[PDB]
């Protein structure tokens, strides 16, 4: 009896947890090798690259999700990080898709009961994003109000 | 604030070091069925396995890291993996790197002139997280080579990795801010 | 009692019709939420242009590109917009993998009601492509005619 | 006995020919809807978009090859063309990959004899590109020489 | 006579070793040819910067991104560069499809010498990732030390 | 165009609320075989199933949202899904959020100074659409857990979702325009 | 040059129209095995099939577009496809659009003020190519619903599509250049 | 750094030419079981196969590039591949192109005025690498058409390809630098 989160079945739980840990580590290392050097900062000044921690996380997520982003590392170390993350992502995503095809070939059309979990995740993410945006707006409005008072 | 960032870095470094030290020292990495003498429910750590129930409840036995009768030897890859898991080199290395990062944080606390100490602390925290990742992967792989569950020591190690990564990011940001202030004062 | 070939729209076979309806609804919802969290706040505005390019049309275009595994020339930069983008990316990965698992098998099923794919199995895709090209040409020509009429009224 | 161009087997020859024709038609229509209007040209003037015929062909090829490019249509008609080409590409590429997975499972490692054709195509393309670049360089050099004489 | 699990580098199993060697050689050749057709002509140059960004390092980066189905921030604009890019894209499509057809099956083959994938089947990928991260940190630190020594020689 | 936008927003809000309320109230959601006695073609909604044609035409029976015997609670996901479907919490929440958005529209038409009311209405309409999506998914999943069809109440709910999303977009546009006009006036006066 | 571009457009339009007219009119679209009376090698076009060998060589028979005995009716989708293939609506539409584009190109010779004639010609050529694509897909699909080969009449239609697309691009470019010259004069 | 680049280019060109020539000449390409009499472990190259160990150690036999009987030419791809492998046209072409590139290096070092000679040398080196790739693929495909290994001549060819590509990159860099210096001098004098 497959559950509502049966789309995670092709990979073991340990694989997903280690994917999260690897994503965090790669984002942190990319940010470090992109921003730690004072010689990458040119005239708080502005860095020669856009790879802050938030942007590093965004780049890593876009690379893993087969989507890409608006920036790409330019330095040798940043490109080493990006290339090794690309290799890891290619292997992991290809393995997931192959094992998912195997799981679905155990031609019957897929039912909504098998993807309801991903729909729930999507709607929860939309709600969380709306809440975060509203919290930021309220904070900025309070800052403006205390500024103008 | 520089003081607030320093306090957060120190607190996180101490928390990560304590979490990893507890994870390495405790015996609740895994909940699996087994024998704690010489198929009952047991909890196992990195060195010894202890029983939860039965006539041998509460008795812990050192883990046979090289089971001779169970496998009668194997190739060199499995032997190397077993040796790496038995030595627990990577969890202990993560503990050592977290301790070195904390020592660097303190040194920079009373060596304000030297700015590369903060960078060393950040590198130490990032490397400790990476060593944690390698140790986790090695432990899970060596377990594989019937329901099992992961105890609170495993998640203590995972949280230690997360906190180490966060503290490394904070230390790198502090290094960048110190160099920013230095260059701003040098400009004018 | 002859064997029945798959229909012209057999590319929709791998997913149920409820899944397709919910995919359309989720696409609309994600585009609307992305536009909302990108544009609603006055602090994201500089006659007064916006910091980002994520209007409703651009949000729809970005969401369609993300679902189609293609990408576009813009990407969300704010935390709320990036949450929407990431969750939509995860949804797209899951749904597209499930859809493309057995597409070729679904395109050649004969129903009683390894060979190469034939053109008859993808003729519907080709028809939709040419229809979209014709619709785009019609829309462009209509817009050109409208601007021509407006300019003729302007210069007279 | 699969040939050296057996990687084209999952799709019939008519599918490949119609793919080429569809690619040409989509590129031409994208260029037409992007550039024909005098109201898209702002002050030879410069267009509001970069979708000339050569760039339209490049965009269509990048979209079909699952790679992307540096530009994306912004107008309604151009975006209709792009979206319908995206739908076509998704269906066709997914069908090709699924039928290829079926063809390769009639676990034995793939041999170089089965991809030698794609290697030959790649090296021929590299040679053609080098020849085109050299021809352009020679033409520009002759133009410079007759300019300076 | 125990069942032998796949090795750490079992992700290379779907392709023969000759194919991998030829893939590396073709990657190098395509990068070199792309750099050549992008940079050799003086008419592609404006102290005198180039019209494009396709140096040898950037060409290698673009080729690696294209093979890895990722993309980068640059794209060839000239006819010869676009021919190189298109043929490399076709090669990548064919090779990557063939490689990823049965990756999961190749990762769980027991040899006498549908279950979820285990972490033991992808531990090699994880090891390579962490090794690359460590190498990148080492390279960045070495570069920082070199610039520090140069600056110390400069201001003394 | 401000008045046209305001009128379109008001009309769309009312239409979406009416469509969602009718869909929740009526029982022409599913056309399937069943029994209305407490195997003939029936029509069922969120609460009641009624036979059409046959001998028991017009007889309605309350849907037993907790079927099957042996009352085992080993799995909590199924119990949660059945409870959520039985309560119809998400369609009713969508109706409530649409009503709140309409109330915000009406209040903004009266206060005319607090621009945040338009933003609140837009948030309410977007959330109503999201709740409608969740309710549709829950309803279809519960139905899955044999030919069938969807009646006009289901498509009324679908159209309500679409119109709610459109009205939310229009309300956000109105809020943006109000703040842009305010900023332009402030800059001009400065 | 404007004159050179006009000459290329006229030559290409005439070539595409002639190629498509020959393709529609000739009987070498497909080489397959069949009977030309009322399993020998035959060549078939859009309307009739003719024999290449045997005692019936040289005798062509009109194609039975609705084979009653071979299929004894089918659903409405197959019937619609068969009717579309039988009428040959799309190849003839492509011929008509190519003729209209050629007429527009010729009409603009003595109507230099009206720049929309060039645009109309370009739209006509692009639409003729699209109609060619649809006709090709319909023909191949209707053939499917044992070795067969495509003759020179089929490739005549393919080349007509390619030339029509090229001529449409050239016409659009000429329209853009005419508007460029007009706006340049308007600036002065 | 101009002299260092020139010396590296010359040394790499010579090394690549020597490695390719040795690989073409020698017969330690493949280690496989066979017979050197006109099933023992042997070593074979592009022309000859020779047994190692056993009783016929050191005996070499010319490779029968046209095996199999019945001499049917229905398929032309197999015949073309067999002829290309037998002639070894692509390894020899790679050797010739490397020699031509080295000659261009020498002529440029002597002429010192025609900058196009450096570009021609770079083109020659890149083409030699491409020809080496084609030859390797053809050789492996012909071998495919049973344990085996690759000897040091095969890896000599591989290293020759790598070095030829590197030297081509260096030559293109030198051509770019020469033209950049020329343009800078022309702009300064203007
Ligand atoms: Cl009801
Ligand atoms: Cl030899």
């Amino acid at each position: 009896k497959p559950g509502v989160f049966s789309f995670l079945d092709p990979l073991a739980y340990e694989i997903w947890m280690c994917i999260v840990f690897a994503y965090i580590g790669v984002s942190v290392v990319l940010f470090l090798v992109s921003r730690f050097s004072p010689y990458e900062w040119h005239t708080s000044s502005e860095s020669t690259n856009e790879f802050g921690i938030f942007n590093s996380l965004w780049f890593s997520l876009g690379a893993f999700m087969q989507q890409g982003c608006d920036i790409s590392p330019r330095s040798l170390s940043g490109r080493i990080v990006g290339g090794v993350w690309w290799f890891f992502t290619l292997i992991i995503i290809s393995s997931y898709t192959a094992n998912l095809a195997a799981f679905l070939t155990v031609t019957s059309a897929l039912s909504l009961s098998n993807v309801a979990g991903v729909f729930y995740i999507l709607v929860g993410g939309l709600g969380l994003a709306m809440l975060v945006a509203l919290i930021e707006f309220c904070y900025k409005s309070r800052a403006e109000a205390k500024r103008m008072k | 604030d520089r003081g607030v960032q320093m306090l957060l870095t120190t607190v996180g470094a101490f928390a990560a070091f304590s979490l990893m030290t507890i994870a390495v020292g405790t015996d609740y990495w895994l909940y699996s069925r087994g024998v704690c003498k010489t198929e009952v429910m047991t909890h196992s750590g990195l060195w010894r396995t202890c029983c939860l129930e039965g006539n041998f409840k509460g008795l812990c036995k050192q883990i046979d890291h090289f089971p001779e009768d169970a496998d009668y030897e194997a190739d060199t890859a499995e032997y190397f993996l077993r040796a790496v898991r038995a030595s627990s080199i990577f969890p202990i290395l993560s503990v050592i790197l977290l301790f070195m990062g904390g020592l660097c944080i303190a040194a920079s606390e009373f060596y304000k002139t030297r700015h590369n100490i903060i960078l060393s602390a950040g590198i130490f925290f990032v490397s400790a997280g990476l060593s944690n990742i390698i140790g986790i992967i090695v432990y899970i792989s060596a377990n594989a080579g019937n329901s099992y569950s992961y105890g609170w020591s495993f998640y203590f190690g995972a949280l230690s990795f997360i906190i180490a990564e966060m503290v490394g990011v904070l230390a790198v940001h502090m290094f960048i801010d110190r160099h920013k202030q230095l260059r701003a004062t040098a400009r004018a």
Side-chain angles (χ1 to χ4, degrees), chain A residues 1-147 149, chain B residues 1 3-36 38-188:
Chain A
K1 339 184 304 301
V4 314
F5 292 111
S6 89
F7 54 89
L8 304 166
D9 280 345
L11 304 186
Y13 159 75
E14 292 100 324
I15 296 194
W16 293 112
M17 184 203 338
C18 282
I19 277 171
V20 168
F21 291 169
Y23 162 81
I24 282 156
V26 164
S27 300
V28 167
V29 168
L30 180 62
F31 150 73
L32 158 67
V33 306
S34 302
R35 291 299 189 85
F36 91 97
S37 199
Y39 309 107
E40 291 148 347
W41 294 88
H42 69 272
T43 322
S44 154
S45 273
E46 200 155 51
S47 193
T48 38
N49 59 85
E50 275 308 313
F51 275 93
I53 180 60
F54 190 31
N55 279 356
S56 295
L57 289 149
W58 189 237
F59 172 87
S60 303
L61 187 64
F64 192 82
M65 286 310 189
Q66 320 274 269
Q67 297 284 342
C69 287
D70 42 322
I71 63 177
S72 194
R74 285 225 154 231
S75 64
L76 173 57
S77 53
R79 273 173 180 185
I80 288 165
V81 167
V84 78
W85 184 241
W86 287 351
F87 160 86
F88 172 94
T89 286
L90 172 82
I91 304 312
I92 295 305
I93 296 299
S94 318
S95 316
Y96 170 79
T97 55
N99 218 31
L100 178 94
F103 264 69
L104 300 188
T105 49
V106 178
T107 67
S108 162
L110 216 67
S111 287
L112 189 60
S113 285
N114 311 132
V115 287
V118 90
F119 275 93
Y120 300 149
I121 290 173
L122 176 73
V123 178
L126 293 193
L128 168 70
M130 276 158 74
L131 172 66
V132 161
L134 287 170
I135 285 177
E136 159 168 80
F137 169 68
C138 284
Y139 178 80
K140 297 248 211 146
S141 279
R142 261 129 70 196
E144 187 100 331
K146 59 190 197 40
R147 202 105 173 247
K149 245 173 174 193
Chain B
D1 213 51
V4 176
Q5 257 164 77
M6 200 52 63
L7 173 75
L8 272 191
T9 307
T10 278
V11 158
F14 169 80
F17 174 79
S18 270
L19 280 169
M20 201 55 194
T21 299
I22 291 321
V24 169
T26 56
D27 287 332
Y28 304 78
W29 279 65
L30 181 82
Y31 291 108
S32 83
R33 340 201 65 251
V35 242
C36 55
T38 74
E39 210 88 345
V40 86
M41 203 67 198
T42 47
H43 65 82
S44 173
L46 292 181
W47 327 95
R48 58 182 83 75
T49 302
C50 215
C51 275
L52 297 136
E53 36 187 39
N55 69 320
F56 289 153
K57 174 191 174 325
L59 297 188
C60 328
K61 182 211 47 169
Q62 288 91 44
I63 287 183
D64 207 326
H65 289 296
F66 287 109
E68 179 129 346
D69 47 328
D71 222 28
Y72 36 94
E73 303 184 33
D75 223 14
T76 178
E78 189 49 59
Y79 166 66
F80 184 60
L81 168 70
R82 276 222 296 263
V84 167
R85 155 78 180 82
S87 55
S88 266
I89 37 174
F90 284 101
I92 297 168
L93 175 62
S94 179
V95 167
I96 283 163
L97 295 171
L98 288 168
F99 193 74
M100 267 162 125
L103 277 206
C104 281
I105 285 296
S108 83
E109 181 241 336
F110 37 79
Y111 274 114
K112 322 228 168 54
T113 61
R114 275 309 260 148
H115 281 149
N116 283 346
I117 313 181
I118 285 89
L119 181 59
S120 298
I123 303 296
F124 274 134
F125 294 133
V126 174
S127 305
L130 290 207
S131 192
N132 201 293
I133 272 179
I134 291 298
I136 279 173
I137 284 146
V138 158
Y139 174 82
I140 298 176
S141 287
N143 272 351
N146 229 28
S147 352
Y148 64 94
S149 231
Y150 291 113
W152 54 269
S153 302
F154 178 85
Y155 298 116
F156 267 31
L159 192 59
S160 172
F161 155 82
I162 291 177
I163 295 177
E165 292 308 287
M166 282 165 119
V167 172
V169 158
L170 277 170
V172 173
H173 273 323
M174 272 183 342
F175 181 72
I176 295 161
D177 279 350
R178 273 152 174 259
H179 262 295
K180 258 171 190 24
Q181 281 268 324
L182 212 77
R183 101 177 55 120
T185 54
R187 270 273 302 164

